[PDB]
Design a protein around this ligand. Sequence first.
Ligand SMILES: Nc1ncnc2c1ncn2[C@@H]1O[C@H](COP(=O)(O)OP(=O)(O)OP(=O)(O)O)[C@@H](O)[C@H]1O
Ligand SMILES: Nc1ncnc2c1ncn2[C@@H]1O[C@H](COP(=O)(O)OP(=O)(O)OP(=O)(O)O)[C@@H](O)[C@H]1O
Ligand SMILES: Nc1ncnc2c1ncn2[C@@H]1O[C@H](COP(=O)(O)OP(=O)(O)OP(=O)(O)O)[C@@H](O)[C@H]1O
Ligand SMILES: Nc1ncnc2c1ncn2[C@@H]1O[C@H](COP(=O)(O)OP(=O)(O)OP(=O)(O)O)[C@@H](O)[C@H]1O
Ligand SMILES: Nc1ncnc2c1ncn2[C@@H]1O[C@H](COP(=O)(O)OP(=O)(O)OP(=O)(O)O)[C@@H](O)[C@H]1O
Ligand SMILES: Nc1ncnc2c1ncn2[C@@H]1O[C@H](COP(=O)(O)OP(=O)(O)OP(=O)(O)O)[C@@H](O)[C@H]1O
Ligand SMILES: [Mn+2]
Ligand SMILES: [Mn+2]
Ligand SMILES: [Mn+2]
Ligand SMILES: [Mn+2]
Ligand SMILES: [Mn+2]
Ligand SMILES: [Mn+2]
Lengths: 415, 415, 97
Amino acid sequence: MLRISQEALTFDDVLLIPGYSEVLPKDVSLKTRLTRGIELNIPLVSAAMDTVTEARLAIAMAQEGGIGIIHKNMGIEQQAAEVRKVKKHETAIVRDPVTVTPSTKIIELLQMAREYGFSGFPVVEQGELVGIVTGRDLRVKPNAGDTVAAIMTPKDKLVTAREGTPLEEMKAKLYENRIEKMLVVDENFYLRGLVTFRDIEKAKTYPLASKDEQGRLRVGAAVGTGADTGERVAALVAAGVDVVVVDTAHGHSKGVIERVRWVKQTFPDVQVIGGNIATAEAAKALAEAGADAVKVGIGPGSICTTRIVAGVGVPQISAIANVAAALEGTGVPLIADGGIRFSGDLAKAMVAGAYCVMMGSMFAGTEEAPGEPYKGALSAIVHQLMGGLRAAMGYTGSADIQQMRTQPQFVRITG
Amino acid sequence: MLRISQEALTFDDVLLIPGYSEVLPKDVSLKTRLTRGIELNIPLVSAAMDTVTEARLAIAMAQEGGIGIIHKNMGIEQQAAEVRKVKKHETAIVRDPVTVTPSTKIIELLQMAREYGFSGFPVVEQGELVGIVTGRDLRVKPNAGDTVAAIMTPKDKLVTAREGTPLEEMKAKLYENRIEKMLVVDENFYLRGLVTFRDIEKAKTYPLASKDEQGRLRVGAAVGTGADTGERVAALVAAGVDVVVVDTAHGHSKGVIERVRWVKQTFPDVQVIGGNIATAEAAKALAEAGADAVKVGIGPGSICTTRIVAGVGVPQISAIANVAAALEGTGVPLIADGGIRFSGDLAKAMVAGAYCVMMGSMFAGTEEAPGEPYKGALSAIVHQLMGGLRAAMGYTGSADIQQMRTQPQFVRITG
Amino acid sequence: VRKVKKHETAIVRDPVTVTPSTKIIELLQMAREYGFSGFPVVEQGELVGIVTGRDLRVDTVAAIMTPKDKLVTAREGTPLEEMKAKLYENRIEKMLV
Ligand SMILES: Nc1ncnc2c1ncn2[C@@H]1O[C@H](COP(=O)(O)OP(=O)(O)OP(=O)(O)O)[C@@H](O)[C@H]1O
Ligand SMILES: Nc1ncnc2c1ncn2[C@@H]1O[C@H](COP(=O)(O)OP(=O)(O)OP(=O)(O)O)[C@@H](O)[C@H]1O
Ligand SMILES: Nc1ncnc2c1ncn2[C@@H]1O[C@H](COP(=O)(O)OP(=O)(O)OP(=O)(O)O)[C@@H](O)[C@H]1O
Ligand SMILES: Nc1ncnc2c1ncn2[C@@H]1O[C@H](COP(=O)(O)OP(=O)(O)OP(=O)(O)O)[C@@H](O)[C@H]1O
Ligand SMILES: Nc1ncnc2c1ncn2[C@@H]1O[C@H](COP(=O)(O)OP(=O)(O)OP(=O)(O)O)[C@@H](O)[C@H]1O
Ligand SMILES: Nc1ncnc2c1ncn2[C@@H]1O[C@H](COP(=O)(O)OP(=O)(O)OP(=O)(O)O)[C@@H](O)[C@H]1O
Ligand SMILES: [Mn+2]
Ligand SMILES: [Mn+2]
Ligand SMILES: [Mn+2]
Ligand SMILES: [Mn+2]
Ligand SMILES: [Mn+2]
Ligand SMILES: [Mn+2]
């Protein structure tokens, strides 16, 4: 008459059993679903933390084939402006470069300059492009009580490209005119972007980039429950957010359920994820409320505060599986959120039933993450992660993710 | 509806239960099979790693009663030349000693000399033996613009032995002529070997030495899958290799199966091992393909990258047993490859069902291993290993290996 | 010693040169050892152009060099402040004396 439901397993309790395999790791397909209406080419999502996902990494994740969820620890208008950044981003275009103006004194220019760590500035007048100044233009004082009009390259010169021009054509003109900056303009010669030679010499055609119907990069955003949530969700949906995540510690509650329903009935053109949960019953509740995806993870970390401060949690491998089984015929995907420290874990989560996995601290050290163990680019981490998934998929003989989630088997281990 | 096949046990989960015992450790028989057509006097095989098995250790292992598998991390002709070394090796004979020539200047001799760390050189002419020079010959310049012809011991002198002469007769003549070098010659007086007094004063009659039908030391070699494999296997079989090991991370695959079959149908006079595997189904696949032995081991190490980077593996004790059971009536042996850190483990593997065990890092520090914790001679390690096996065999009352593999029992333990 | 004695402070006497002719693969290869890019292009004494870093971001130097009918030269001893003046107005870094 002690009330134990079951024995629950985490990642370190199980291993994947190798199977007959005809497809090589490099040839398996990693494409999956984030929500019933959103598809990722890789099963990766970055977590909604101020140390992890803002616009900068959100972009990176979208380009890599996954998605980022902007964190809410910031003003409403700030969070929506991050969503704007990601939704409006083109590869290497600064679409809002720092500018100057014919009448800005050269004293101000040197000052700016210094403050920013670069020297190239388009000269504008109420949006109209009228000239450009750079480092070369500044190598002599004509003698300084004078302005950018005096040293800038005048309008009649100026190499320009229209907005939406391929980088190649764009690269070609920079070299042929032996210059380093390309000014993007529109049909009225208003300045729409800056594109540098240095920025073109990097970063691909991301053929996996997760894009919306309009060819813009996908992004999500977190929201809590209570009072500003409705106002918050509204600004985020106005910003063009693809998916709204109702992100909480206890997803199996009146307040979370009600809010997921409220979102899905008020903003019918967004996708809604509901979370965190860890049981079958919780899963069915969010599905009924109309959740487009369900997020799985309560006390999934052995030292995490949920376990230790509250004595609450469910080992992730059994949580995921219990939720997977619950959502069977629904078409509602599940995301595995927490407790993954190695790429082996990511494979295990997938075979347990996840459609893709959310990660926090993996990405937290990265070059893209906010501010300032600095792990360098997100490229290497994401590549290693998928590297291991593919290896796992090779061993088990799973050609794609549907198969990986449904067919391989585990051995239970001890120590 | 979480998909667990079973609970799997590793070495630290079990212990051997002592039984009625009439034969002492020193009196049990350790002879076993490596492949259906190759017999070892001890159940030891050294692993195919650039840090472990090249010709030098391959020899040592053969002489000790086991076998070595030359690694593939080298050019095709290089790997085959290692196989040649082992297959052509006689105890203490340098069969390709460094030589000189009547006309090599004494400047060159002193130089060589230094470079090599020894001073004794047979003097030859297109294979014909014509004289010898050593340290004593070099203790005065007659005055150096002159050659080895001038200081060497002439042909008419020269103690020689024909090739294939016992070391005793050979030792006897060295002492009686009070000299340190024996020159081996053939029926035309062509130089076939050098045999030193220092080299005779060491190393036995290895009565356990694993030899082929022609009395040459046995050796194996690893090969992968893909493109040069066919060419590689061909040069290795031309080199006289006893056994070809198709050594891969995932043995239960189209590519490995197909290649094992290809080898066994193209080179019918070699033995073929197929690997790594960890399930019963995998075992049956390689047996069907015609494997002469099967190698067992996937993620057998608690920290190993397979487990951690890919989340894949099967604890070795259950892998071995599951494979043993599968190969029952076939006559196809199984080799246990990975996860052994103490000699107790080696006994456990044997009782679990292995015919012999492959080891890597055990031998990796050794004097024979490639280059440069230096563990000294392979003798001591191999002796300690078998020491513990014999003790285990004493406790369980197993007079030989067939019995050890089939009769004793385990207790399951906890911590 | 000659190396020092041939140093002005900066007019550089005896500069490293190249030819249209010399392969583009080899340029790039200099380039990298010498330090510095930028080489007055010469045939057999006569100045026929100039090749700097900007010309290289793209078989002979003939295709990518900056040609004679476009070179900014200054005759010797033009003072240095006059020479800087001209360098500024052409928005270039190297003056050929
Ligand atoms: N006005 C600006 N506003 C926003 N971003 C800028 C601006 N100017 C430069 N950047 C960013 O900084 C990068 C480097 O600027 P910088 O002026 O150093 O380029 P550059 O003159 O081409 O340098 P280099 O001569 O080494 O190629 C650009 O590629 C761009 O990403
Ligand atoms: N798109 C453009 N059209 C016309 N002129 C330009 C353009 N971009 C830059 N310039 C002009 O070309 C000259 C060189 O500018 P650029 O920015 O390429 O080099 P820089 O970064 O100033 O030089 P450096 O790399 O040596 O510091 C300057 O006079 C600048 O005003
Ligand atoms: N020409 C050679 N080619 C290959 N190996 C050699 C050659 N000469 C010597 N060795 C190896 O080096 C060992 C020692 O050579 P060294 O010349 O020191 O012998 P040594 O003169 O008999 O020494 P000591 O006088 O101490 O007995 C030999 O036993 C042999 O294994
Ligand atoms: N097989 C042989 N037949 C005839 N003479 C030999 C033979 N081997 C060596 N000698 C000669 O015997 C002499 C002594 O040679 P040996 O190699 O035994 O001693 P060493 O190593 O030169 O002397 P030490 O050990 O003091 O350095 C030399 O003149 C050498 O040329
Ligand atoms: N072809 C050459 N032969 C000999 N000396 C040279 C040559 N080119 C440059 N130098 C000298 O070595 C230095 C190399 O600098 P570099 O050629 O990079 O100048 P730069 O391109 O004008 O530099 P920056 O772009 O940073 O202003 C120059 O200051 C010059 O004194
Ligand atoms: N004396 C000159 N006359 C005519 N053109 C020149 C002269 N010197 C350089 N150029 C040309 O001007 C352009 C840039 O040359 P410059 O040496 O000023 O740039 P750079 O050394 O490549 O500077 P960075 O690498 O810092 O951009 C090239 O097209 C080059 O051929
Ligand atoms: Mn610049
Ligand atoms: Mn530059
Ligand atoms: Mn000696
Ligand atoms: Mn001696
Ligand atoms: Mn320069
Ligand atoms: Mn410059």
